[PDB]
Amino acid sequence: HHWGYGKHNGPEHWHKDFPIAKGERQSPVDIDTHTAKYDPSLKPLSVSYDQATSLRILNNGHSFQVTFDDSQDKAVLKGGPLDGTYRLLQFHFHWGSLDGQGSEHTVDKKKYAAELHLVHWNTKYGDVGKAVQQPDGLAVLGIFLKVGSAKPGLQKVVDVLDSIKTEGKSADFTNFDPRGLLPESLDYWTYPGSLTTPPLAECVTWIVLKEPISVSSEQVVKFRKLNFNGEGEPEELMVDNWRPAQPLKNRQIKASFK
Ligand SMILES: NS(=O)(=O)C(F)(F)C(F)(F)C(F)(F)C(F)(F)F
Ligand SMILES: [Zn+2]
């Protein structure tokens, strides 16, 4: 069993290969808005994506991702709850089979149709492999998707998905500007957590934006036409590629806003 999202290899099985799945700082979590504490010491988030260089778009059999040149400080996250500078490596999404599920984080138990993760690593560790071994190695910016109006800045992504249908396919994907995926407000919740896929390392400062973006039904339908399987294997729609909320345990979720 390679891990996945199915009955026999999904999230409830992951602890067998990755025992940290039952750890003290696992992600995602439910964000209980009434118990999150406003922290006036939290700084505004600094998102500097003007010089981003996208490279490729890839179906990895679990999601699709857009990868960036992370060999220089071109697209960086700073400020917020963070110390130092975090380079953008990639973004990807989690989504559902229907609009009432798909997000990893939840808000007062509400599930969104999808969740966008912009993955960044701390430059003090030099490379992402080293960063995942550190408790402050990664910063993932999470953005909820609800279904309504289209997000124009997402359309270039969805229009190429037919070229990466099955696991193992990739395409050139240059000049994509991730600023077109961001909501108006950068108000956020933050807490210490983990990767939400294997190896589930406890290396992430999570930053989850309060404001969702809206995407159209046609845009999310194109996500749902992707396949978990490789070409030639039985077709299994890439849907419900989300890990459920995990126990908060001894953690405090902090809000940047009142
Ligand atoms: N969902 S998530 O924690 O962003 C993640 F996909 F697991 C991930 F962090 F991006 C990751 F895949 F583990 C990696 F960091 F390797 F990119
Ligand atoms: Zn993710």
Swiss-Prot record:
Changing T196 to D/E: what effect?
Strongly reduced activity, but enhanced zinc affinity
Q: What is the effect of changing T196 to S/V?
A: Reduced activity
Determine the domain of life of the protein's source: Eukaryota
Q: Where in the cell is it found?
A: Cytoplasm; Cell membrane
Tell me what effect the entry lists for V119 to K/R: Strongly reduced CO(2) hydrase and p-nitrophenyl acetate esterase activities
Q: Where does Zn(2+) bind?
A: H92, H94, H117
Alpha-carbonic anhydrase domain location, by residue? 1-257
The catalytic activity, as recorded, is: hydrogencarbonate + H(+) = CO2 + H2O; urea = cyanamide + H2O
Concerning Pfam families, the annotation shows:
Carb_anhydrase
- SMART domains, A to Z: Carb_anhydrase
Q: How does activity depend on pH?
A: Optimum pH is 6-8.
* Effect of substituting E104 to A/Q: Strongly reduced CO(2) hydrase activity
Enzyme Commission identifier(s): 4.2.1.1, 4.2.1.69
* The keyword Acetylation is annotated on this UniProt entry: yes
Q: Which GO terms describe its molecular function?
A: arylesterase activity; carbonate dehydratase activity; cyanamide hydratase activity; zinc ion binding
Q: What is the effect of changing H117E?
A: Strongly reduced activity
* Site residues by UniProt (Fine-tunes the proton-transfer properties of H-64): Y5, N60, Q65
Q: Which residues carry this modification: Phosphoserine?
A: S163, S170
Role noted for this protein: Catalyzes the reversible hydration of carbon dioxide. Can also hydrate cyanamide to urea. Stimulates the chloride-bicarbonate exchange activity of SLC26A6. Essential for bone resorption and osteoclast differentiation. Involved in the regulation of fluid secretion into the anterior chamber of the eye. Contributes to intracellular pH regulation in the duodenal upper villous epithelium during proton-coupled peptide absorption.
Q: What is this protein called?
A: Carbonic anhydrase 2
